[PDB]
Design a protein. Structure first.
Lengths: 158, 129, 59, 116, 46, 65
């Protein structure tokens, strides 16, 4: 069962990309940390409570996608309650936004200043990254190549 | 631009002058009710300009925004001023200015923004008859 | 049953990718079997965050 | 605290059902309240004052409409409310008469003639 | 589009199916000015 | 404190003014719902958005009755 699958988990967190006695030490720290918390519909609602915070924080189609998937997840129950409590632990375009050139019936309306004003900003975050990239690759190498004499790689420490 | 905005003021002076003149007993109970239902929309113009006053006090009102704001209320005012000119022009009182209201009520059907306005004044003015 | 659990393992990847977990497929497979045991998932989300901290303390 | 569970507190008060007993309604609540949170129309407490007066005329009352102005005075004298426009617009929208066309009657502006 | 409406709205002896097109052509100028109002707010421009 | 109980008096004052306005209009809300609606309206919310909900939840308790 699960405590044998836990051994495969202890092999994953150890670098595979030796490795037999470091596993016995990592297994000790794994078991020593595991039992501290364990010693001491209202379920889809927890996903809805974060979809609200999605909709307030911009990004409309992501929350509209999330509420489209929580209907099919109800058409194993302890797994999504783990996912909702691991939702912010994750790793840190589109041609259309304002084209009425397609369709057969589109409603007549004016400007709003929250659609096309924030469609040049969707690209402005891209152009303001692709130059901040240029400052995060020439700095990270000039920090290696110039500090002071006697600084470099630890092969001189051999 | 100021001159482009001004016809709704020329079409408010005439409206209030009609409401003062034709609420008297020389024009009968139908004209009393007619100006008394025209008065309700005059109150609404007074409401609108105070909301725009709150906008100007917060430094959030300009000439361009005002010109767009007054355009939906200009059509209603235009209906009232044309109606007042027509009843003054033919000296119509009693049931002739219920016949005129019957003609004007069928006249406006284009957007149905003016149709409801004239229909309310006919509903109010046909009560004494 | 063995045909069912492969399809369930494929669909349970999707709902954990949209919610932006830190879980990869292997640790997803271990944690999907562990949550199905009955041990409260509200505590399992915390023991994983402590395990991944104590392994980084050694590195 | 967060606004979303506060919506479920409202859901416990109006329904006989608890918040944990229903999730189809809370789905719709997350649909409506999100992306229409934080005012997007022009505020005016004055129009709300004159429309609560306009509603008390519809109940054939003129005494209680000038007592409402003293409560409107007291509202400002305490001054602990953030949007005095919003809660009174909200109570006026949920008003029920004890016992046509009104879109051509004065309303708040959409702020689509203005940058937001 | 404003020049055509400039004579049609002062002609009251005309088709009432043409004074429905012309009243679906007051909305189409009001919306132009709406567009301009939003642009005027953003002025405070290249 | 003492001045912290005077503010707890000045909020009951407001809540009584709002409780008066809630009854002279004869709304559907009771005092307990109203205490959630004041918290919502303090944050800054569309009152056009909440009223549509309240119009559905009151007919969703006729889907309970």
């Amino acid at each position: 069962s699960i405590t044998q699958l836990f051994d495969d988990l202890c092999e994953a967190l150890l670098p595979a990309a030796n490795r037999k006695r470091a596993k016995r030490s990592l297994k000790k720290v794994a078991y020593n940390a595991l039992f501290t918390n364990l010693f001491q519909l209202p379920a889809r609602n927890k996903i809805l409570m974060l979809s609200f915070d999605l909709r307030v924080g911009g990004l409309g189609p992501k929350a509209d996608r999330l509420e489209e998937l929580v209907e099919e997840l109800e058409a194993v129950g302890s797994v999504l309650d783990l996912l909702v409590q691991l939702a912010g632990s994750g790793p840190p375009r589109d041609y259309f936004l304002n084209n009425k050139h397609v369709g057969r019936n589109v409603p007549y309306s004016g400007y709003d200043c929250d659609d096309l004003s924030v469609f040049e900003m969707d690209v402005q975050s891209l152009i303001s990254r692709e130059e901040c990239l240029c400052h995060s690759m020439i700095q990270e190498t000039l920090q290696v190549m110039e500090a002071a004499p006697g600084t470099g790689l630890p092969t001189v420490g051999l | 631009l100021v001159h482009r905005i001004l016809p709704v003021a020329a079409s408010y002076s005439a409206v209030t002058r009609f409401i003062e003149e034709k609420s008297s007993f020389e024009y009968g109970q139908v004209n009393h009710a007619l100006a008394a239902a025209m008065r309700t929309l005059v109150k609404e113009h007074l409401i609108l300009v105070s909301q725009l006053e709150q906008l100007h006090r917060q430094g959030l009102l300009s000439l361009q925004k005002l010109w767009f704001y007054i355009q939906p209320a200009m059509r209603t005012m235009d209906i009232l001023a044309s109606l007042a000119t027509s009843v003054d022009k033919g000296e119509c009182l009693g049931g002739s200015t219920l016949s005129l209201l019957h003609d004007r009520s069928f006249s406006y059907t284009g957007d149905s923004q003016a149709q409801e306005l004239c229909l309310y004044l006919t509903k109010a003015a046909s009560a004494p008859y | 049953n063995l045909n069912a659990v492969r399809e369930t393992m494929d669909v349970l990847l999707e709902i954990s990718r949209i919610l932006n977990t830190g879980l990869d497929m292997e640790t997803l497979s271990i944690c999907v079997r562990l949550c199905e045991q009955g041990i409260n998932p509200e505590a399992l989300s915390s023991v994983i965050k402590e395990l991944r901290k104590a392994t980084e303390a050694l590195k | 605290k967060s606004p979303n569970v506060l919506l479920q507190n409202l859901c416990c008060r109006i329904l006989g059902r608890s918040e944990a007993d229903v999730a189809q309604q809370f789905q719709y609540a997350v649909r409506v309240i999100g992306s229409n949170f934080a005012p997007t129309v022009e505020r005016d407490e004055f129009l709300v004052a004159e429309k609560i007066k306009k509603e008390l005329i519809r109940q054939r009352r003129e005494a209680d409409a000038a007592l409402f102005s003293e409560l409107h005075r007291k509202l400002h004298s305490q001054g602990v409310l953030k949007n005095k426009w919003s809660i009174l617009y909200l109570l006026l929208s949920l008003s029920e008469d004890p016992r046509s066309y009104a879109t051509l009657f004065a309303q708040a502006l959409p702020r689509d003639a203005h940058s937001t | 589009i404003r020049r055509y409406t400039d004579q049609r709205s002062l002609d009251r002896s005309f088709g009432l199916v043409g004074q429905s097109f012309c009243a679906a052509l007051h909305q189409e100028l009001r919306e132009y000015y709406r567009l301009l109002s939003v642009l005027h707010s953003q002025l405070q421009l290249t």
